[PDB]
Design a protein around this ligand. Structure first.
Ligand code: TC2
Ligand code: TH
Length: 175
């Protein structure tokens, strides 16, 4: 069993206007992370990881996540397929993920060369999960951007213990 804070309606999740897919490319650090299955752990805090976006000829993204785990760099590859509006995506090859029936990505805000906020919603084993990432082009962002991210996370119904700021590291994510 399992008890989750409900996903917000999509009406509460803004979309970046005039989204520019070419400018969103490249490496983003995960400076903030919040969601209904994200929990602060002071015993063993979340380490920063990175996500690299590469725009393919057909305008899908190849999306590679890089995490430092058990002394090694762990890589995860996904495809984001353009959805109903620019800045919105669904997951490619969804059938290769057991239990997954739905996956949605919406770029909420970005200035492309410093920060972004991205919303994800998925249905897995019939459970609805959502998260929000605060991306930085660098490993640090201003207090202002972080407090905005906190405000936005709370507006989607998340309490403070479901909002995490991964600790900067140098392994793997400096690629
Ligand atoms: O989900 C994470 N941890 C908790 C266990 N899991 C919950 C299932 N996934 C999620 O809650 C989730 C929610 C939206 C999109 C995803 O890809 C997810 O894994 C998690 C951890 C580090 C970075 C992430 O980006 C995560 O999503
Ligand atoms: Th995932």
């Amino acid at each position: 069993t399992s008890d989750l804070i409900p996903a917000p309606p999509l009406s509460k999740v803004p979309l970046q206007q005039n989204f520019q897919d070419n400018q969103f490319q490249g490496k983003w650090y995960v400076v903030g992370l919040a969601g209904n299955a994200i929990l602060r752990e002071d015993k063993d805090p979340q380490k920063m990881y990175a996500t690299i976006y590469e725009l393919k000829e057909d305008k899908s993204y190849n999306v590679t996540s890089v995490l430092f785990r058990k002394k090694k760099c762990d890589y995860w590859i996904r495809t984001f397929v353009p959805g109903s509006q620019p800045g919105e995506f669904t997951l490619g090859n969804i059938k290769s993920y057991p239990g997954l029936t739905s996956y949605l990505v919406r770029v909420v805000s970005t200035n492309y060369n410093q920060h972004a906020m991205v919303f994800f919603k998925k249905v897995s084993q019939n459970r609805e999960y959502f998260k929000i990432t605060l991306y930085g082009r660098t490993k640090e962002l201003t207090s202002e951007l972080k407090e905005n991210f906190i405000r936005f996370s709370k507006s989607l119904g998340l309490p403070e213990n479901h909002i995490v700021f991964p600790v900067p590291i140098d392994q793997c994510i400096d690629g």
